[PDB]
Amino acid sequence: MKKLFGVGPDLLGDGKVLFEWSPKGNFLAAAGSKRKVNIFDRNGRLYDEVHFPPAEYPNPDGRACAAAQMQWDPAGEQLAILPAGNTHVFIWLAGNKEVQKIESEFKTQEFSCMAWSRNGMYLGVATVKGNVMMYNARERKKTPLVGKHTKKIVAAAWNKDNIMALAGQDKTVTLTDGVTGDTIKTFHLKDVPMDLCVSDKKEDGYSRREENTYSLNINRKTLYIMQCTAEGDRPLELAFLDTYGPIMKHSWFGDGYILLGYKNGYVAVVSSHSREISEEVHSGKYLDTLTDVTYCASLGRVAMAGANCVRVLDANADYNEIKGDAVDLDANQAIEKVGWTKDGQVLTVGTHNGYMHSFLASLPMVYDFHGTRVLYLTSLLEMTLLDVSRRQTVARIELENEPAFCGLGPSHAAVGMNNQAAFYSLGEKVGKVVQRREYLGTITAIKLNETQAAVLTGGHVVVHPISVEAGHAPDELDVVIPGPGQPANITCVALTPTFVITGSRTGTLSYYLSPDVTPVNEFRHD
């Protein structure tokens, strides 16, 4: 991979880096030893800095993390930071930057773990005495629930059934409803778990599509799979080989698969169904240390957390160490948490002494084709007009605006965060700022030709020659193809020099011989 961004022990301190990505992909919150969380950007810039109050139970270990267990809800609206040794839960809003300090309603009781709902409207944060507070995102009220466990709940996860599930130190799994507040089911473990991953167990029979099968890594060696969907009520026993090491943390992923991250660098995958349950489909030695395993369920990428390096396993290619994706770091750190973006853009690597490490994955598909020339992208700052046939660089188009679209015209290239048209000429200057047209609507289907860009924005084919001279404005030069007074129905436009081909919803494939507004032909796609 190529290095995108990385922070030393300055905004984190000389400690372990624990992170979680937003599902939006534009926010990454990394917490280090010092009591500050660095919310990052898609480029890795510091989006927001939050300062914690002095903790009532400060951490005596320097090589650790200030946040006990933080996570992002799968909606991208709130960040629930849970600092270590505190009596508060910081809901960080990604919209207005304000920190919602939710005090503990259990009369100054130290929190242990939290869990985000898959729907996003529910939140359950656990204490070290087993008490779990209830918080709803849609109403902003705090509801205390006194008594769920008798000891510290190490981790917790929600499900799609709105059932609060907990992994407490009292060797119990409480499946309490998030609406009625009643314990629906209770599963008794044999020892102390440390994680809780709730995902579907697909079988060849009939199983429920909602998250109802739970899984807990017990003693960091043994994983129980109890089904609640349609079959059985017992934790179906899994026996794993002791030579592979201890599973430091499991994480359910894929089609019922289990990401068995064995602490000795071993990786296994166990399928979960009725016929064979205890078999290990994936078997291979990959590292010597595995302090963290993780999965992104969009690219099939499994990241390792070794003592010195980070190995990327491509689940699309049967968990192979792609060294073009794998990362070797300096021999003075120890990757404690490794992660992916929830949709997957950046390999996120956190070491034990504050080296924030983040690496751009396989490059995004920001490409447009106009003949053999391809307006593809090589990095988030510059896309590259590079011909496939010649493999010799034609244009390294710098993108001051965010790369979200590229309109490959023979004259210009329109880039921007789907409303800005950062028109980038491809002639005398590569990537020059021709126009910065923050359009009135989203730039849906722009089409650039030798003069104009058919900026189909707001359902209107905005047609305007991009090379606007000094003293002129493209805004008045926007020749709206379904002009003001004509209904807008075009959902794709093929701006060509011969014809401005506009694909309407009504089928009016209009053919404007003059590039502005006048047709000599109009195809009716009935």
Side-chain angles (χ1 to χ4, degrees), residues 332-353:
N332 212 59
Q333 40 82 41
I335 303 108
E336 276 312 302
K337 187 152 207 183
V338 66
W340 303 98
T341 311
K342 286 205 173 174
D343 54 344
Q345 188 183 70
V346 181
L347 170 60
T348 301
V349 169
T351 77
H352 86 291
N353 74 298

Side-chain angles (χ1 to χ4, degrees), residues 295-301 314-316 340 343-345 361-362:
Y295 190 74
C296 174
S298 43
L299 297 155
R301 297 222 182 279
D314 205 16
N316 313 336
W340 303 98
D343 54 344
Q345 188 183 70
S362 167

Side-chain angles (χ1 to χ4, degrees), residues 482-493:
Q486 187 176 3
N489 59 5
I490 302 145
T491 56
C492 61
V493 54

Side-chain angles (χ1 to χ4, degrees), residues 374-407:
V374 175
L375 201 60
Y376 91 104
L377 184 134
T378 50
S379 68
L380 287 184
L381 183 63
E382 52 170 357
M383 80 205 197
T384 302
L385 176 64
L386 172 56
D387 195 0
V388 192
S389 305
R390 79 179 220 167
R391 302 151 177 81
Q392 181 48 53
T393 288
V394 179
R396 296 276 164 100
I397 296 102
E398 61 272 6
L399 320 174
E400 295 90 357
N401 288 122
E402 302 172 83
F405 74 107
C406 64

